[PDB]
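User: Predict the complex.
Assistant: Input components as received:
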Amino acid sequence: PRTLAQEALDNARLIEMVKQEVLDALRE
Amino acid sequence: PRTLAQEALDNARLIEMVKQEVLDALRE
Amino acid sequence: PRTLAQEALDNARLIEMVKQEVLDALRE
Amino acid sequence: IPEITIKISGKTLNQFTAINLTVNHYINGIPSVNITLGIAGDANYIFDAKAQAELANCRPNNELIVQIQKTILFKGIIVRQALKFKGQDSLMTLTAKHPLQKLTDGLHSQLFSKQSDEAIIKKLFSQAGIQTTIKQAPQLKTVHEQMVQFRCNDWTFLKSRLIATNTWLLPGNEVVTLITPKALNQSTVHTIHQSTNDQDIVLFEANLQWDNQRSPKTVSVQSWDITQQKLSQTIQVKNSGLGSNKLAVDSITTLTNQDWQWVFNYPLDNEQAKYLAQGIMDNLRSDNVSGSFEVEGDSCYQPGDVLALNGFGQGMDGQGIITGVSQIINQRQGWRTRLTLGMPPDAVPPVKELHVGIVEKYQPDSQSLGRIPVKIPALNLTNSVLFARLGKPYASHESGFCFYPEPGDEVIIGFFECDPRFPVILGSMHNPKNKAPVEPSEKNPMKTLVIKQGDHQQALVFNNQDKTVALNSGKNTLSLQQDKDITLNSANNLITNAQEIKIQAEKSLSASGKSGVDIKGAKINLT
Amino acid sequence: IPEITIKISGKTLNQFTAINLTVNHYINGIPSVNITLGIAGDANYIFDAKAQAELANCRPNNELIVQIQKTILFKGIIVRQALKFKGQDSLMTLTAKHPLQKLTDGLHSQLFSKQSDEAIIKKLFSQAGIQTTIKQAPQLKTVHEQMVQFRCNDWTFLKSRLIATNTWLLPGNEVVTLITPKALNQSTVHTIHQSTNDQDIVLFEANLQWDNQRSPKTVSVQSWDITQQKLSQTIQVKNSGLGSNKLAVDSITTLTNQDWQWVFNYPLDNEQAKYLAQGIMDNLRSDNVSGSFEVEGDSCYQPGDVLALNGFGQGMDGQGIITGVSQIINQRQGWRTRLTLGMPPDAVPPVKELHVGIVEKYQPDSQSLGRIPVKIPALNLTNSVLFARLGKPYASHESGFCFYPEPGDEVIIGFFECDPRFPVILGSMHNPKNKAPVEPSEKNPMKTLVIKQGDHQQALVFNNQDKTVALNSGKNTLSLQQDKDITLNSANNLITNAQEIKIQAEKSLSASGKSGVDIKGAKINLT
Amino acid sequence: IPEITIKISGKTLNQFTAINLTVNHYINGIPSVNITLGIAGDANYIFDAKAQAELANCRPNNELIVQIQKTILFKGIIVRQALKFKGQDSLMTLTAKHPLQKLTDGLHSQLFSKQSDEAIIKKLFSQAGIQTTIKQAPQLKTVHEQMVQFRCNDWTFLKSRLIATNTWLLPGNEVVTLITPKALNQSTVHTIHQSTNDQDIVLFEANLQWDNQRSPKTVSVQSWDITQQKLSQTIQVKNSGLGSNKLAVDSITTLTNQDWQWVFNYPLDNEQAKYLAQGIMDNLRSDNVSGSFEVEGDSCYQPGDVLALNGFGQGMDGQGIITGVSQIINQRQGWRTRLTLGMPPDAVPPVKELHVGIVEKYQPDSQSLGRIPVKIPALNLTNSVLFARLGKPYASHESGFCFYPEPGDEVIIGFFECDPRFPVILGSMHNPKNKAPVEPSEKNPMKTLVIKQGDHQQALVFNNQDKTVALNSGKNTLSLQQDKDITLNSANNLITNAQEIKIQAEKSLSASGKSGVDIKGAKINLT
């Protein structure tokens, strides 16, 4: 989780979760 | 923060703050 | 990353990058 | 942390144990609860018969009650059930909402005639089966001549009326209360002291915020007065009156001294405009002062209560209305309660279209504005009618093209300000049931203005083919033809009365009569 | 993990190595791929000539193919290329999309006349160059008299037609399939067993969810019948038919028993209304049951397949339609595949404006509704025309103000329900090419209703200046003047016919004739 | 890191020390600053008298200045003040914005007549008290006959006019500059070298991005020509001209060769359409090339400058416009500056409603289009008027229903393309001040067309009760009755002139005269 390759992987996992919850909240 | 129960707590706390800041900027 | 001053730094950095990706996805 | 009991559909769960719990109550919102469940101590397998039987009983629409001793933290119905499996680990999450959630279901249109806002609101709650009370809200007694809900659920319609009449909704677990926002300053007060003894309220984490990005200095509402043909008296609102001292929303200095002006194109009396202006001002100034306070868990806190900060200094001392209360239960922190100050910003759901309508039987206009009763199939399905003002190609004082449509005619309906309460007629159309006297043709020779009922016809006809313009009422007719004669045919007598008559012909005058020509007079001088 | 090959514009990369890869396919969506690249082992400097030459070859619009052995995981074009530099570390990310992305480019308006939905859809794909097939969708054979796309791209127009005709889109890598949602229950089944042998599907992490916040009990569609002047027969839809057992979307209990009602202001036949009602129902009920299942990577999974859960108990057993398949490739976890159930909710893109139009040459109306062919410059640029209803100041059975506009006239065009397929004419206007007979003036003395085509002129004139109202057809005229005489001038003969004639004068009657006065009759009795 | 001074309302803080600082400047945006404050070293208690006194002095609307040596990093007004309490720890956060924030306050409507865009824009800034300059923007000299702002603040109105006139806003700390986007390629250049000496710009982290998902190949703008009754000459725009080499936005290959077409329903001259088309193209193509570069902190960077990459290879070499500059101050990283390339995509704020209006006194139309001056209460409150086209039931060349409304009549106002600058009259309506000659009734017996203007009355009357159609001008009248006689009554003389006259009666002809019947002529032949 220090160089670019792993940071992209960890962040993308967080982005996917965040988008799903925010989209659900906005559509609610 | 390893099993499902604790992960739901930490993730929800991060979700609540992210949603508030995103909503504020979208309405700005 | 324990007291209030530093927690503002780390979370704001995460907020800025999360907001940019979510806004791009919403406009997509 | 006291005893927590959870009853789903009347019974307590046997296989699943509540891991986490969070209950939210907010003003002008639908309270919700989130519960996390799981099987403890490897007592049973997640896919066993007993575990699955409990799983099927937790499906949505089931009733859920969260209770501490006798106090009911939450009563509602489950809306979402979720499972999560990761290896051998499993977890269940339940989301339940207040019975006010039932207002969000459905999509229809209906009309309210000669009913007050209190009557309409009480009707909406009764359909969902919700008890309601009204406190210090006399503005709901006013009667609306016609109130239209167009293609929206009851929750959206109620929210529009709540802002328009300047009222807030307190979602109790048993009774829902509607109250004027300013009347909440007199409610019960929970005080937090900076210098405290050992039995006062313990404050763990606090939040405060002062903002002026959405604070108007004044709000002006003006309406078009149909009777006077002028803009009505302008109504100005300069304060909200919420809070006090440094937590008062009125203590925030605005960016500019400009005015926010609304000029409606439909009539609106002074009393209703004042409440609408105040409702707009409170909507924008609600979030001027906002924050969150986390205290030791207690069930006596309710939204709408007053939270007072004492002894914290000249920069924080004041009072505010608790707009939201959240209860949090977990093993790590026990029972904690979070109080909220402020509210994020939110008249009638709008039409956007052109509609068709049928002119109804004559009814006298209550306001004597000359409106025409029409039935709009989309806006309602009942027998009640709407009054729409009539548009004409020419209209002035004591003159104009006055051809009022007959009952049963098909008309084009437009709306002022896209408000369904103010329809207007833009024209009539001919359909296969109301046949047009003239059909469109290649040459389009004849233009006419006909009135014909039964066997009787009166018309003015322009004919391009033979260059004639004629007036006729049945068989009697008067025709003028270009490059030809002026013909006057009657099926009966012909009477001309005048002081003097001067019949002159450049070639010849040939009178006639098949049974006599009687020339009366006093001096018949031929020459 | 098998061999992964990546060919960009037909060739494999020599300097960059694929680090991470993710491919997404979804129903009613544009499949996408994300690839992370980098230089391995310090083989070359990032800013060297070879590395930069490869960098310029990965620019957008280049073709990208991801393939395992012969199987093609993804085929598309690069839309986004991004670089990240942090000290000596560098990383490149590529985003490519299905050829369906080309439907999102452009913004125009066009009209389709007497074409079916299948013909229109096949035309749209052909412009982008996409092969298509239709399976078990007979509803696309119906012919639309006029179908209008207004200021939108092809993707938005297609998505509106898919919902209106109750059709789903399966985005294959070579062929795009359109199919009725209910027909997907008969597709191939991939079964997951709780009690499993060693060659079955391995399930790593699973998610399930039951919700009822957007589940209507019934959907009612009603339309205005122009011919009958009534609302058409109501059409009710009560089921979706998607899934089975505990995974069926119909097993969710709704919040209330209320009905969701649509009452359109335009005609809509029964067959089209049934398909529209079913499409609305499936749109809201698609996400009643949803979740994600993560299994071992395999390329035989396609969206539209049926995923069955067997042996998991009475709370989870059922079947569901796989609405999305995602492939994930990375070093830490190898090849993994994620299956998705459910779909988030989404007729014609709307106009919002008032439009100008030109009345076209006469054409017979197919439906015999009396509509007028007009050409709207904004809606289309071709030679095809639109049929629009005509609004009149007065219109009833066998009577009204019937003055049909001539070809070439400029008219005001409004739309029913903001639908471009149902224009209506609200009035005609005068322009510097169609001169008004009377210009606006300070005193506004003369009002008239003229018809003048060439030298012919028939008119009815109101003149305030001299207090006269006159009828004239060329030179022949009839004038009535207040406080004065009634004047009847003719340039030719004057014929009056009646049974009886009674000419009376209070002062005197003075007949005349320049070449004779012939008084015929049978009894000329003077007195 | 140099000395940082922070002056709030003219003075520096004594109890709070700046922990963090971030200043943002962007093109077409309102610059903002975020500052984090706290008490250092337990010098004073947070709730003490001195600490609370500073707390009340940091309230919103206070002036805030951030300055390095003489250079002013930021000047603005505090909009948000936030407090953070957690146990004994406390923290304050301030947000301040550029004086351009004052343009976002307010909500009103106003009309600009015969003023250029430069005059309107300069007026808006003067109200907020902002100095402005214009560079290389001759397109702002064009004069608009009527420019309408409808129910929006000055910021929203300004942003619409900037895009329509193809202008960008550079928010300086003292002077706001408006400039054509293409003119920014000639600005000062800051060059970054891959092979560098020890006094060049140090680059820490960089980002680059090429996209084509929103890149149109061409943009076509067409407008309706009222005078010629045709669509105007189409205007095509194919380039943006921003950037150079590999960072040029035009180097991105588009998805398809399709054209993006706008066809407005209102007139628009060739010059204004070209600027609007260019503004549309630049809006979509601004973000084709985007990225962020982080360099050593320096105050000479301003938005609008050109950033050049040299020596980085054939895949990155080029130039670009710095659309945003951010300054970051913290203890861990010192002073750092971030430069941004590209801009996310954003003519007149639209009306949506039907409006009432009052016809004004006659004024000559400047364009000779025959428009009628009306006053719309909602759109403006001043004495200036708007010109609106008139809709008629029938209108063609030298013919139509020409009844121009009198001053003071009430009319329905619709808008072309929902643009407040192009109103149209759809009809006149009757009010309790302009009484209708006929009131609606149960039987609706009489239809008419009256021109009564005091004692003078001219009308054409259709009466169903007695089945008559009549023309009358005062007392003189002409009546035709079905199954009855044709009656012609005059209060004065009766003159009939014709070449030949043939009065014929099937029963009898009975002429009369109370003081004589003079039958002139040259041959009186009785029979």
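Residues 20 and 26 of chain A are 10 Å apart (CA to CA).
Let me know if you want any component modeled separately.
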